[PDB]
Amino acid sequence: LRQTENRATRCKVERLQLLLQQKRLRRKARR
């Protein structure tokens, strides 16, 4: 239960990390 909650948290952490990397690449592209 707690372990699978941690797994889901890790999944969303990876998702948002990739999204943030894309966002900052796009930002630095123009700035």
Binding site: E5, N6, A8, T9, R10, K12, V13, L16, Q17, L19, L20, Q21, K23, R24
Partner: protein
């Protein structure tokens, strides 16, 4: 803490770990990427104290920057539910301080229900208020 904060958190005891971890976000204020990178490792600990402190750290990191993306929203609405225990004060306070000026009906409607659910002790109720 940034060098080796795990030992620092562990030598911290009782309820201290909450604030000890939130200090990580305070240090990594306004830096979403750095905060996430330095908080992910501590985000998964056997004791929920460290997890809630990490949630506070992420909320503090998000606070002050109005990024259209809402990593704080996603991560912290994942935990806004009591999860069978009252130790969600950290999540609630983090969400608040992160979205202070946002006034997003999304976060308002996420927070108001959990505020009264027959299981939100006065601590949780005050934090969410």
């Amino acid at each position: 803490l940034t060098d080796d904060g795990n030992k620092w958190l562990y030598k911290n005891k009782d309820h201290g770990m909450l604030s000890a971890a939130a200090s990580l976000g305070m240090i990594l204020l306004w830096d979403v990427d750095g905060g996430l990178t330095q908080i992910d490792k501590y985000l998964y600990s056997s004791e929920d104290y460290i997890k809630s402190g990490a949630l506070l750290a992420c909320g503090i990191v998000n606070s002050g920057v109005r990024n259209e993306c809402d990593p704080a929203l996603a991560l912290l609405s994942d935990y806004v539910l009591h999860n069978s225990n009252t130790m969600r004060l950290g999540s609630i306070f983090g969400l608040g301080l992160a979205y202070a000026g946002s006034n997003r009906e999304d976060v308002l409607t996420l927070l108001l229900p959990v505020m009264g659910d027959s299981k939100s002790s006065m601590e949780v109720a005050g934090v969410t208020a």
